[PDB]
Symmetry: C2
Subunit: 204 residues, 2 copies
């Protein structure tokens, strides 16, 4: 889809390391295979938001801030603005706090020409308590709001999500997977690199 | 209660300003009335996590990180560790992601001698979609996990929460309020200062 983000080799690196030196080393070593990196709070809180621009300048990669924003509208707006000002191309937002909280993020993304990814579901143990049961409705909420980028969770769940958001929407998830998702997210299998990344790409 | 945090004058300052200069000015001007300050991502992402230690050193105040942690266990652990390493006395965590995600935070707080506050409910418009209906269960989940600190949201809702967590638990919320909550959180009425704070205290 021309209107959606193009992820090199359909492979997104989940850079969850907290040490700047280690984070930079791994990412640089795989830049020939990946152009999209997902960074979270562990690294940013430990090294500072300036690390986002560093990644973009040193490697020319797209940065997705895996912040899972889940605050009230006004605060969500501020978090998004600060994150986009720091250079992030996109931000991941929780849907459980409701539509207004998601729209607050969409508004800033609109004004700054950036992107919002809606996290529809999580797959860790405790996710079955409240998240699993709200996943479909959260995905539908996103669709009704015009959200075009989604982060999905179980093969059959990914299939259900794709059904709700349509064939046009951009979907990323951590052979089978790429039948529904537009790009796969890989972490440890890489940063824990160039050979590993090359293998995964060759595998798909 | 001796085993719970003592908040000076039962008044917590919600420092939501994103400018370091403005944030420091207001807090210093009310330190003779307040010893507990709640800081969130807007300020921290914009000025850096080092601002937490700055607040504690310049004013000798307790800092509650209003991060509303809502990630998977491993990431929650890292966020809490980084936040406590930066000097935060306590951190606010979401309950919607489930018990394991909350316990991950409790584990780090236990190891570092810090505190975890469970956010049981939010009051912004979109909160009725998913949060309102899970509030009671989230509060009960916290109780069953030994959580001792809670952040509450409607007067009658505060009464319901206090009922679930017991009379011993520490509860903070944004006269009537202090009938159920141990301390009230005030933001704009102060940072938007010394006179305002003094009035609120003299009020209660």
């Amino acid at each position: 889809r021309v209107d959606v983000m193009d992820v090199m080799n359909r492979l997104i690196l989940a850079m969850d390391l907290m040490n700047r030196d280690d984070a930079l080393r791994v990412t640089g070593e795989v830049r020939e295979y990946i152009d999209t990196v997902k960074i979270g709070y562990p690294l940013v809180l430990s090294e500072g938001m300036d690390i986002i621009a560093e990644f973009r300048k040193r490697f020319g990669c797209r940065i997705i801030a895996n912040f899972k924003v889940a605050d009230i509208p006004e605060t969500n707006e501020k978090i998004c603005r600060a994150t986009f000002k720091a250079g992030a191309d996109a931000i991941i937002v929780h849907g459980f706090p409701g539509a207004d909280s998601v729209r607050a993020c969409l508004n800033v993304a609109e004004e700054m020409g950036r992107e919002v990814f809606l996290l529809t579901e999580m797959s860790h143990p405790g996710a079955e308590m409240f998240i699993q049961g709200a996943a479909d409705e959260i995905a539908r909420m996103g669709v009704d709001l015009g959200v075009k980028n989604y982060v999905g969770p179980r093969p059959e769940r990914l299939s259900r999500l794709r059904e709700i958001i349509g064939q046009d929407s951009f979907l990323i998830s951590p052979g089978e997977t790429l039948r529904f998702a537009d790009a796969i997210i890989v972490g440890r299998s890489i940063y824990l690199p160039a050979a590993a990344a090359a293998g995964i790409i060759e595998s798909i």
